[PDB]
Design an enzyme around this catalytic site. Structure first.
Site, short mmCIF file in Angstrom:
data_model
loop_
_atom_site.label_atom_id
_atom_site.label_comp_id
_atom_site.label_asym_id
_atom_site.label_seq_id
_atom_site.Cartn_x
_atom_site.Cartn_y
_atom_site.Cartn_z
N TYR B 28 -9.61 14.65 -24.70
CA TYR B 28 -9.78 13.35 -25.33
C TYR B 28 -10.73 12.35 -24.76
O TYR B 28 -11.20 11.52 -25.58
CB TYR B 28 -8.37 12.72 -25.57
CG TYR B 28 -7.56 13.52 -26.57
CD1 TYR B 28 -7.58 13.11 -27.91
CD2 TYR B 28 -6.83 14.65 -26.24
CE1 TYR B 28 -6.88 13.82 -28.90
CE2 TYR B 28 -6.10 15.35 -27.22
CZ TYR B 28 -6.13 14.93 -28.52
OH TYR B 28 -5.50 15.63 -29.50
N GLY B 30 -13.82 11.02 -24.49
CA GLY B 30 -15.19 11.41 -25.03
C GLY B 30 -14.95 11.32 -26.54
O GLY B 30 -13.80 11.09 -26.96
N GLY B 32 -14.11 11.91 -30.24
CA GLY B 32 -13.14 12.84 -30.87
C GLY B 32 -12.10 13.15 -29.77
O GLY B 32 -11.98 12.39 -28.82
N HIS B 48 -5.49 6.08 -25.74
CA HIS B 48 -6.51 5.03 -26.09
C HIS B 48 -7.07 5.31 -27.49
O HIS B 48 -7.23 4.37 -28.29
CB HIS B 48 -7.56 4.96 -25.03
CG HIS B 48 -8.66 3.98 -25.19
ND1 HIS B 48 -9.95 4.32 -25.41
CD2 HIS B 48 -8.64 2.62 -25.08
CE1 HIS B 48 -10.70 3.22 -25.38
NE2 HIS B 48 -9.90 2.17 -25.22
N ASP B 49 -7.38 6.59 -27.73
CA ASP B 49 -7.85 7.10 -29.01
C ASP B 49 -6.86 6.63 -30.11
O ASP B 49 -7.26 6.02 -31.12
CB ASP B 49 -7.93 8.62 -29.00
CG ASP B 49 -9.22 9.19 -28.44
OD1 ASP B 49 -9.90 8.54 -27.66
OD2 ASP B 49 -9.54 10.36 -28.78
N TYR B 52 -6.94 2.74 -30.84
CA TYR B 52 -8.07 2.46 -31.69
C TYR B 52 -7.75 2.90 -33.09
O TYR B 52 -8.11 2.13 -33.99
CB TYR B 52 -9.36 2.98 -31.11
CG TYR B 52 -10.01 2.08 -30.10
CD1 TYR B 52 -9.31 1.40 -29.10
CD2 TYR B 52 -11.38 1.89 -30.16
CE1 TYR B 52 -9.95 0.56 -28.19
CE2 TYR B 52 -12.04 1.09 -29.22
CZ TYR B 52 -11.30 0.44 -28.22
OH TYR B 52 -12.06 -0.31 -27.36
N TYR B 73 -14.43 -9.18 -27.06
CA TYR B 73 -13.28 -10.04 -26.74
C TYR B 73 -13.63 -10.73 -25.40
O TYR B 73 -14.72 -10.53 -24.86
CB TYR B 73 -11.98 -9.22 -26.56
CG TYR B 73 -12.15 -7.95 -25.74
CD1 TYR B 73 -12.28 -8.04 -24.33
CD2 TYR B 73 -12.16 -6.69 -26.28
CE1 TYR B 73 -12.44 -6.89 -23.55
CE2 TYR B 73 -12.31 -5.54 -25.55
CZ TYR B 73 -12.43 -5.62 -24.17
OH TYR B 73 -12.56 -4.48 -23.39
N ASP B 99 -7.99 -1.34 -24.24
CA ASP B 99 -8.97 -1.19 -23.13
C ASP B 99 -8.24 -1.43 -21.81
O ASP B 99 -8.22 -0.55 -20.97
CB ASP B 99 -10.17 -2.09 -23.33
CG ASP B 99 -11.09 -1.78 -24.46
OD1 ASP B 99 -12.13 -2.41 -24.70
OD2 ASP B 99 -10.79 -0.77 -25.14
#
Ligand SMILES: [Ca+2]
Ligand SMILES: [Ca+2]
Ligand SMILES: [Ca+2]
Lengths: 124, 124
Positions: B28, B30, B32, B48-49, B52, B73, B99
């Site tokens: 994960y 990177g 995709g 994190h993926d 988002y 932000y 983040d």
């Protein structure tokens, strides 16, 4: 974003307190605006108002609750000069400049105590 | 925004170079991701993926070219601790935390050189 604008002004006019200074000044510095600006500082405000109106017309930018004041961008303040981060996205870049332009604008214009809290219903 | 994420990591792992370190790591970290994360750091990335992906489902948030990485932000980095400005709007606040969470995540997880540039077509 609004909180960043005040701080950009302070940045530009160290000796100031924006909230107090530029809020409710002339016909345009403050919510809304109507009529013709009463002076140069007021014209700075009118021009910013117009900047935000244009912003709003960017089919690619869709601000939270349609309020550009809600968009936070990245800028730096170093010894009176303002830079808008070049990494801001196109929408942010746009709001950044309206703000930057207003601040310089406010800096070079003459302030008239008379024009503070004007009777807009009558002179604008 | 992407440029702020790298700097948040550097913030969190002073001794690092994110670009090099976490890009193309496991399944994960990177662009995709597919399969099941190969370890804990990789799971940080997967999470994190997913952050988002959720972001994207906020009917009130409409990111430029639908890419949350494009949203800037406001956060601060002071001596290893990350704070998301409380004045960020709801959309920005959301990306800020994804983040922030990833960075702490990366900090406390064990890194495996083995997992760098994996043959994703085979192990993911
Ligand atoms: Ca106004
Ligand atoms: Ca990924
Ligand atoms: Ca923003």
């Amino acid at each position: 974003a609004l909180w960043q604008f005040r701080s950009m002004i302070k940045c530009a006019i160290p000796g100031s307190h924006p909230l107090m200074d530029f809020n409710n000044y002339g016909c345009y510095c403050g919510l809304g605006g109507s009529g013709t600006p009463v002076d140069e500082l007021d014209r700075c405000c009118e021009t910013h108002d117009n900047c935000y109106r244009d912003a709003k017309n960017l089919d690619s930018c869709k601000f939270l609750v349609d309020n550009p004041y809600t968009e936070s961008y990245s800028y730096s303040c170093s010894n009176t000069e303002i830079t808008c981060n070049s990494k801001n996205n196109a929408c942010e870049a746009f709001i950044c400049n309206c703000d930057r332009n207003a601040a310089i604008c406010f800096s070079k214009a003459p302030y008239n105590k008379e024009h503070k809290n004007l009777d807009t219903k009558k002179y604008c």
